[PDB]
């Protein structure tokens with residue numbers, strides 16, 4: 001148990017918490033090399049920007065690169081995730097949102113949970129998102145922005161857009177917050193953005209409202225997000241389940257491991 005009482009309180013009240021410097025520069029380098037290799041793999045798990053010039057998102061890199069499997073079992077991620085949820089955990093979703101320098105596109109304002117509830121039959125928000133900065137995150141390269149404390153409202157109901165932006169995953173556009181909702185909410189739940197060097201870890205709640213702007217800077221923003229889910233909270237889909245690359249199916253409890261990534 002590494003999170004302090006203050007850190008757990010911040011997660012409960014504000015919906016997110018930043019752990020700076022969890023991984024060393026050398027460990028970041030190993031992960032970036034594995035990302036460069038994984039970005040070249042062909043398949044439906046690889047989502048391009050709308051302009052087709054770069055990758056926008058990669059799914060399930062932990063099934064293809066050893067270091068990302070190691071990362072997902074590291075006690076530096078699972079320790080904190082287990083403190084917050086107090087249960088056995090497994091990977092519901094593993095993604096890297098690779099927002100390129102010089103025009104990497106935005107991510108619409110949204111909550112995560114309603115998407116998984118309505119698309120995948122996820123019963124409850126008994127999950128936690130764990131971000132790992134593979135780039136330095138600054139005000140300039142399209143950081144995740146949270147509406148602080150906005151998870152306390154619970155789920156803000158909406159229907160999925162008639163047509164989907166992508167047939168490879170659910171882009172948050174499909175379930176985006178309306179301008180009216182965001183305008184009402186922001187007075188009590190102000191915009192905040194964790195900013196820190198690569199190797200930092202960011203935990204955030206599946207019902208916090210979050211989004212991010214285009215990256216006009218000369219610096220990329222590669223953000224890895226592992227969504228850990230309570231093994232007792234496995235999805236119960238209505239129709240055919242979505243692919244395993246986007247929605248995890250192996251509910252074996254993960255056992256944390258210590259030591260450096262390689």
Ligand SMILES: C[C@@H](CO)C[C@H](N)C(=O)O
Pocket residue numbers: 093110111112115169170171172246
């Ligand atoms: C809302 C979004 C996660 O930030 C959903 C994810 N793209 C999925 O396809 O499950």
Ligand SMILES: [Mn+2]
Pocket residue numbers: 110111112172210
């Ligand atoms: Mn999200």
